[PDB]
């Protein structure tokens, strides 16, 4: 079930890296490697106004 949490944080574009970048306004997340190639959000299609690096702390 560690797998389950592991899937949770996995970028849904590359299906590989963990998500670190949140899109605003929509709030969907991708990994830093996928982000720069996305003009629109792959999940909801909302335009991406800005990209914020997230920190777990």
């Amino acid at each position: 079930q560690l797998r389950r949490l592991q899937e949770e944080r996995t970028c849904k574009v590359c299906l590989d890296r963990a998500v670190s970048i949140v899109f605003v306004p929509c709030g969907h997340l991708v990994c830093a490697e996928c982000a720069p190639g996305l003009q629109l959000c792959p999940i909801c299609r909302a335009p991406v106004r800005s990209r914020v690096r997230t920190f777990l702390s």
């Binding site: 899937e7 969907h28 999940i43 909801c44 299609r45």
Partner: protein, 77 residues
């Protein structure tokens, strides 16, 4: 009421509490609050058929434990 599953675009399966008399719009709203996808981007499919907004779960004969599929809004052509 009763519960159904939706397989979300990204592939996770979420569970929803629904009335058999709930409209498809009803469900898209629940999906929106959960997944953050606006209803107009949602296309819901059950038994390989799209579910239309103005209808209910009963119209598609959707029962307890049914698995609905979510894909992006698409345009026929």
């Amino acid at each position: 009421s009763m519960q159904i599953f939706v397989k979300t675009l990204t592939g996770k399966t979420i569970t929803l509490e629904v009335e058999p008399s709930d409209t498809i719009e009803n469900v898209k709203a629940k999906i929106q609050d959960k997944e953050g996808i606006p209803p107009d981007q949602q296309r819901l499919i059950f038994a390989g058929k799209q579910l239309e907004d103005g209808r209910t779960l009963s119209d598609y004969n959707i029962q307890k434990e049914s698995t609905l599929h979510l894909v992006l809004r698409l345009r026929g052509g």
